[PDB]
Amino acid sequence: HHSGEHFEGEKVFRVNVEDENDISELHELASTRQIDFWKPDSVTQIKPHSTVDFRVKAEDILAVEDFLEQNELQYEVLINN
């Protein structure tokens, strides 16, 4: 299917890091953060089993949602069913 074909972002990409593995991936994005964090991040200090949130941004979502799905980088959304 497509991603951004008359749709918005309408999602709350929350994150749930388990350990350093998960961090090590999300951490990269920071360099070119298409996203911004909400409560509480400061990426440099993210550590295991932690829970932080992002926001409903759109248009460039595809890369973010992809960066979060292809690997299932423990992201949580409360707008599914």
Q: Give residues with Cβ within 8 angstroms of 30, minimum separation 6.
A: 43
Q: What are phi and psi of 64, to 5 degrees?
A: -70, -55
Method of determination? NMR
Q: Where are the domains of the chain?
A: 1-81
- Write out the two tokens for 29: 């994005």
Please state the CATH superfamily assignment of the domain spanning residues 1-81 in this structure. Metallocarboxypeptidase-like (3.30.70.340)
Q: What is the 3-state secondary structure (H, E, C) of the chain?
A: CCCCCCCCCCCCCEEEECCHHHHHHHHHHHHCCCCCCCCCCCHHHCCCCEEECCCCCCCCHHHHHHHHHCCCCCEECCCCC
